[PDB]
């Protein structure tokens, strides 16, 4: 009589879905294809919307402890400060990916979510079957495709898909803060350091806590030095000399990767008893820092709609209808910002830009008015 859910993917979306369902009394199994549970991407920003999901997951305290809210979100163009934004009190937070992942994993385990590593979903059936790489077929009342941008769950079913790949990427790293070595300045701030001259090179500077700094080093794919990993120390120091102590530490990271990314928009997110959440459904440009925030809101919202006393099929349809427009709008605006390099101007976290962030999934209203 206990409802059964199978979740494919052990990322932020899958873990969120698993915790939220388990909290509602579902028997939940989560499948992670990797040998271990781990989050990549170095660091991550969350906002009010994602912090509220964490609150609703009972995972907020572990996240806030050991993460950071900068005094301000500052933007530079060619080393000149062009804006400082604090979003009228809107809560936000920076942390390492592992920090967020660990909080979600610990909460999942505390609740008795069944987690299988080395377990890869290769197909899903709308009537409620999930097939693993081994050949094993699992039956369930709900199947969640939270398996990222190349979702086999999605592709095993076939969803009409708008796909785009970014030509340019970036290198994301965690390094020591080296705060004392940085000297005079406001080194607790987020600082988005844009340049187009003498070359296109940008650093998003993002403190995660008193010990760890998240750096995003962005240069065109066509730049053989700026895009190099391990980093070409000289060309980063040249344009960002005030960050030399941290860049010296970054140069030690021989695991650095130049990551490109893609965006995804689907004609829908559901088929029968199958729901797609996270990047598998709606991967977006990083400009508004809402990829995971939207993913978490969506996975959390899915659990909510499954409490209405409907069939799973109808609840899934109602879920997309209810919650998707917030993601569609955020994805679109983020895409525009990215295409137009809008963030380079500063002062671009407008009310419309902050729309996803303002959404409270717990009370289902918009908060922190701008």
List of residues contacting ligand FAD (CB under 6 A): 8-14, 31-34, 41, 44-46, 120-121, 146-148, 152, 170, 261, 278-279, 286, 289-293, 295
Which residue reads 């398996």 in tokens?
147
- Measure Cα distances from 236 to 227, 228, 324 in Å: 10, 11, 40
Task: Of 336, 149, 359, give the one whose Cα is nearest residue 260.
Answer: 149
CA-CA distance, 161 to 229, in Å (whole number)?
Answer: 32
* Cβ proximity to ligand FAD, 125 vs 238, nearer residue: 125
Least distance from ligand FAD to the Cβ atom of residue 273, Å: 17
* Cβ proximity to ligand FAD, 38 vs 179, nearer residue: 38
Query: By the 8 A CB rule, do 312 and 21 touch?
Result: no
Least distance from ligand FAD to the Cβ atom of residue 232, Å: 20
Least distance from ligand FAD to the Cβ atom of residue 225, Å: 20
* Cβ proximity to ligand FAD, 26 vs 258, nearer residue: 258
Query: By the 8 A CB rule, do 157 and 166 touch?
Result: no
CA-CA distance, 234 to 223, in Å (whole number)?
Answer: 14
Least distance from ligand FAD to the Cβ atom of residue 294, Å: 7
- Measure Cα distances from 267 to 8, 54, 110, 153, 160 in Å: 21, 28, 36, 15, 6
Least distance from ligand FAD to the Cβ atom of residue 1, Å: 27
The tokens of 27 are what?
């028997």
Residue 134 burial (C-beta neighbours within 10 Å; 0-12, 13-18, 19+): exposed
Full DSSP string of 47-58: EHHHHHHHHHHT
Query: By the 8 A CB rule, do 280 and 147 touch?
Result: yes
Query: By the 8 A CB rule, do 202 and 218 touch?
Result: yes
Phi-psi region of 66 (alpha: psi -120 to 50; beta: other; left: phi over 0): left
Least distance from ligand FAD to the Cβ atom of residue 91, Å: 14
A 10 A CB-CB count for 137 gives 11
Least distance from ligand FAD to the Cβ atom of residue 38, Å: 7
Strand bridging mode 359-360 / 365-366: antiparallel
* Cβ proximity to ligand FAD, 29 vs 273, nearer residue: 29
* Cβ proximity to ligand FAD, 146 vs 306, nearer residue: 146
Q: What is the DSSP letter of 287?
A: G
Nearest 10 degrees: Cα torsion 169, 171, 174, 177: -100
Least distance from ligand FAD to the Cβ atom of residue 309, Å: 28
Least distance from ligand FAD to the Cβ atom of residue 214, Å: 9
């Amino acid at each position: 009589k206990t409802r059964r859910a199978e979740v494919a993917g052990g990322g932020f979306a899958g873990l969120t879905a698993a915790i939220a369902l388990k909290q509602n009394g579902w028997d939940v199994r989560l499948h992670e294809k990797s040998s271990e549970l781990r989050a990549f991407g170095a660091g991550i920003y969350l906002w009010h919307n994602g912090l509220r999901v964490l609150e609703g997951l009972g995972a907020l305290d572990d996240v806030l402890q050991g993460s950071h809210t900068p005094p301000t979100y500052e933007t530079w163009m060619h080393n000149k400060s062009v804006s400082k934004e604090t979003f009228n009190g809107l809560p936000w937070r920076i942390m390492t990916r592992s920090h967020l992942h660990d909080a979600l994993v610990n909460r999942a385990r505390a609740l008795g979510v069944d987690i299988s590593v080395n377990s890869e979903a290769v197909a899903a059936d709308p009537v409620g079957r999930l097939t693993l790489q081994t050949g094993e077929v699992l039956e369930a009342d709900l199947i969640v495709g939270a398996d990222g941008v190349g979702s086999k769950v999605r592709d095993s079913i076939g969803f009409k898909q708008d796909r785009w790949v970014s030509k340019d990427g970036l290198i994301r790293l965690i390094v020591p803060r080296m705060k004392k070595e940085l000297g005079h300045g406001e080194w607790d701030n987020t600082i988005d350091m844009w340049n187009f001259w003498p070359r296109v090179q940008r650093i998003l500077y993002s403190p995660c806590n008193e010990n760890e700094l998240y750096l995003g080093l962005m240069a065109p794919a066509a730049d053989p030095r700026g895009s190099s990993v391990p980093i070409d120390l000289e060309v980063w120091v040249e344009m960002f000399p005030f960050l030399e102590p941290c860049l010296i530490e970054a140069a030690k990271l021989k695991t650095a990767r130049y990551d490109k990314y893609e965006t995804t928009k689907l004609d829908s997110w559901t088929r029968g008893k199958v729901a797609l959440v996270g990047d598998a459904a709606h991967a977006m440009c990083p400009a508004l820092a809402q990829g995971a925030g939207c993913a978490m809101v969506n996975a959390f919202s899915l659990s909510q709609d499954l409490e209405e006393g409907s069939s799973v099929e109808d609840a899934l349809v109602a879920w997309e209808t209810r919650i998707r427009p917030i993601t569609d709008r955020c994805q679109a605006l983020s895409g525009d910002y990215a295409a137009n390099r809008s963030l380079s101007k500063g002062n671009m976290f407008t009310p419309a830009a902050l729309e996803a962030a303002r959404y409270d999934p717990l009370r289902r209203v918009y908060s922190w008015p701008q």
